Write a protein that binds this ligand. Sequence first.
Ligand code: HEM
Ligand code: HEM
Ligand SMILES: Cc1cc(N)nc(C[C@H]2CNC[C@@H]2NCCNCCc2cccc(F)c2)c1
Ligand SMILES: Cc1cc(N)nc(C[C@H]2CNC[C@@H]2NCCNCCc2cccc(F)c2)c1
Ligand SMILES: C[C@H](O)[C@H](O)[C@H]1CNc2nc(N)[nH]c(=O)c2N1
Ligand SMILES: C[C@H](O)[C@H](O)[C@H]1CNc2nc(N)[nH]c(=O)c2N1
Ligand SMILES: [Zn+2]
Lengths: 402, 403
Amino acid sequence: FPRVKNWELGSITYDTLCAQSQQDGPCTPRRCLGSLVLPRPAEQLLSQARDFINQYYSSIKRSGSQAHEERLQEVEAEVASTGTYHLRESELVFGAKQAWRNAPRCVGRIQWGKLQVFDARDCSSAQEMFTYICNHIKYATNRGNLRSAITVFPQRAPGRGDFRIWNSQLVRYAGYRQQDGSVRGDPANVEITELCIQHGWTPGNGRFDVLPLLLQAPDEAPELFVLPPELVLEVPLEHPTLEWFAALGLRWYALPAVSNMLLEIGGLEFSAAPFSGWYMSTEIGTRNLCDPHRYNILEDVAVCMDLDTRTTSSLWKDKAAVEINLAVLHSFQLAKVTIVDHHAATVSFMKHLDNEQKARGGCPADWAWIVPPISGSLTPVFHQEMVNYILSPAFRYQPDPW
Amino acid sequence: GPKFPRVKNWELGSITYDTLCAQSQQDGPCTPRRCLGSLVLPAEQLLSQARDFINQYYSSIKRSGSQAHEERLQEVEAEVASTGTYHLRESELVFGAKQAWRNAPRCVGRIQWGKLQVFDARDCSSAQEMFTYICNHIKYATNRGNLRSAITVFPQRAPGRGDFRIWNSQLVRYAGYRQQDGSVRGDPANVEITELCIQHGWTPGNGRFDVLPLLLQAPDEAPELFVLPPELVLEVPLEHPTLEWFAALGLRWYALPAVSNMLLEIGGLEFSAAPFSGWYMSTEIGTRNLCDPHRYNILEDVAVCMDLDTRTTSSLWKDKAAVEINLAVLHSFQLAKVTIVDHHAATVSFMKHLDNEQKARGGCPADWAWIVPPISGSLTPVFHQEMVNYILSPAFRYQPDPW
Ligand code: HEM
Ligand code: HEM
Ligand SMILES: Cc1cc(N)nc(C[C@H]2CNC[C@@H]2NCCNCCc2cccc(F)c2)c1
Ligand SMILES: Cc1cc(N)nc(C[C@H]2CNC[C@@H]2NCCNCCc2cccc(F)c2)c1
Ligand SMILES: C[C@H](O)[C@H](O)[C@H]1CNc2nc(N)[nH]c(=O)c2N1
Ligand SMILES: C[C@H](O)[C@H](O)[C@H]1CNc2nc(N)[nH]c(=O)c2N1
Ligand SMILES: [Zn+2]
């Protein structure tokens, strides 16, 4: 059991929760691979299913009861005959919150118990997927007052193709490759933009064109659906003191909704299970707008600020980055859309660690992802040691469908 | 593909494989069950370590398999066979010291690894001589502000005999005085060593920036106290380029970062006292030393001077003050003509180092959480670079405090 120290305060805990991990990560005693973004039978499903049902009845303080025993028998009966089984809705709700709770790269986990779960397992077409996706967006957005949500489409089955959302997020901006090899719009979405085009989309030519959805029912070609512009809440970016900033024409969408991850609960796998909460300002202000392989606006802003771009030592990059993050915070706050800054978020994450220590004896956490991309050591999480491991229920990466 | 870790740069889309990790002979704290990467601290044996190091040396001069290589090997085992230890040739020490710096996963300054002035102090026999050696190191390394990387190597651990030790964690640190109030005047990181200095007869000051004396230990003796002559300790008064009041804060830092309590291991030999130094990266002073809550903690003071709204997180008052403090550090060192490197130039040059080592050794052990600077992380190229972390020898290691 690893000793875990906070270096700001000198306090120590022991992670005992990590002993519950059944799935290996990428590190060995010879070498740490913790900085890598991606990872390089009835008997098995049955034991994962049992473990998960044990978790569910333990959660509701009914561990060992009749309802518990008879549910374990239902699952056993179903697997033995069909090679698979099905979750009850309450179990799925428990499973979804648990997967979020268990996500080591998520800093917003203090919110984990507050999650609206939409059961969409009765979906038989891409068209119906779209309807469900539209309700989710309407619900989650809630006129700027964002509410965390997940919609769960039908689980994977051995004899057939997956339900999939091809887009990585429900709302994302197009990336158009230009003749001069440069990208107009968001360079992270060139490929998906190109797919939307080969499947019949009439593309715009702006910097912030909301992409259509490519939704796929089993063993069918994906289908194209345009989101009604009134469902996609956006925030124009202005700066509190710098009046020229708004003339940059910059904007971002309100709703961060991840749509291409796989949700695993009790050995069952949900290949389409889009989920959303609200932004932490550094995601937009630092990563989306300042990454050199994204909108890459740092120099433009610095020049507008009349900073000296000749040399690194003037810290023109740091200065511009702070104003961009400020603009995001201010703009969202002006537009009455839920946003959280990296100080507020990391402070609440520290509380989460304390809560989880008492409740479960630990919390899986990925330090490199929890610590924000500006002002790292200015946040309490920088000084907190963390233990990273895989618990189930879990969110996972899966291959792109194309 | 290749059965070696695949390493991706996400800014550029480039891929490499680390083959160098195969050479690792020591385990870190990670397992397949759990990653512990964020933890700050996690005769037959000697001979195999020695043989490996000697093989390393002869490969580095391209004489692997040669008569001289096999003779040295035979010479090493004969020394161990009769004495339980062996000794390094002068040039072997030089190579091993540079290699230990090259191998250090947490150092971003490694582009400079081949430019290291190695002082051989393996003749040192008293605390007074240790002092002389250290003063010469400080004088050479400081070079009136044109800093030069250096290491001074004192005698190795002997069986049955006591260690040479510098009790201080650095050759230059500021005192931390615990107050009746409960608070600390000076550097709170240095409370214990300050209190040890007073116990061993140092008459303390009562300032925020009092240079500590050295507590130096020759084998099997109590440590002796030595005051550095102040003309040897170059310091930089901090001022800001445009914020005129910053100078009035009376902030300052010393020029020479010199780690003094680390163990240098080479071929199984352990050098308990081998202090080394380079020059600062500006974030070390401006962000950590000055803005950590458990250090000088000046963020609020500076933000108040800048008239920021310190009552709400979303004003980004902390981010704004930190940037200016960091700029003040850079500006002040540049004005004073003291070598310093900003976090952008340092990480850019570290990326070049990664490419050099890919070609030369097939990888570079690097600790991502330490390589990425404490401000402006994703603004530097290293944030977007995946890294493989593992232990290679020769190495620098932490060692227990002597008291
Ligand atoms: C409620 C507000 C939330 C905030 C402020 C938040 C914040 C974040 C941040 C900053 C990251 C790091 C990802 C990055 O920067 O690229 C992250 C990752 C993640 N979040 Fe949260 N999150 C929230 C809600 C949720 C919800 C509702 C779920 C699912 C039910 C969730 C699941 C995840 C998962 C699985 C990851 C890891 C994805 C990956 O490995 O890229 N989060 N979150
Ligand atoms: C030449 C200029 C140098 C720069 C800019 C530099 C920079 C750094 C930085 C930023 C760190 C991270 C440590 C922290 O933030 O606490 C570090 C660690 C380290 N450096 Fe370098 N360094 C330099 C020279 C050297 C030299 C000459 C050596 C030894 C020969 C060395 C060996 C190490 C070691 C062993 C560590 C990890 C131990 C620790 O501090 O925890 N460095 N360095
Ligand atoms: C639900 C929720 C709320 C908030 N605020 N935030 C989040 C994280 C997502 C949004 N903002 C970034 C992050 N996830 C998007 C990218 N992450 C996958 C990394 C990856 C993997 C493979 C290939 C790639 F190109 C990239 C989720
Ligand atoms: C040679 C050289 C040049 C430069 N620029 N920089 C350096 C690193 C030192 C200077 N600035 C901090 C760092 N040395 C910090 C001490 N080691 C790790 C932290 C630690 C470990 C154990 C207990 C603790 F309380 C703290 C060396
Ligand atoms: C290579 C490195 O692991 C990668 O750039 C990670 C680092 N930390 C991160 N942290 C968060 N929150 N989001 C990210 O996309 C990343 N990227
Ligand atoms: C808890 C965490 O491991 C610790 O605070 C580390 C993080 N990264 C660091 N990186 C550097 N360069 N120096 C440090 O002291 C630290 N501290
Ligand atoms: Zn690891």
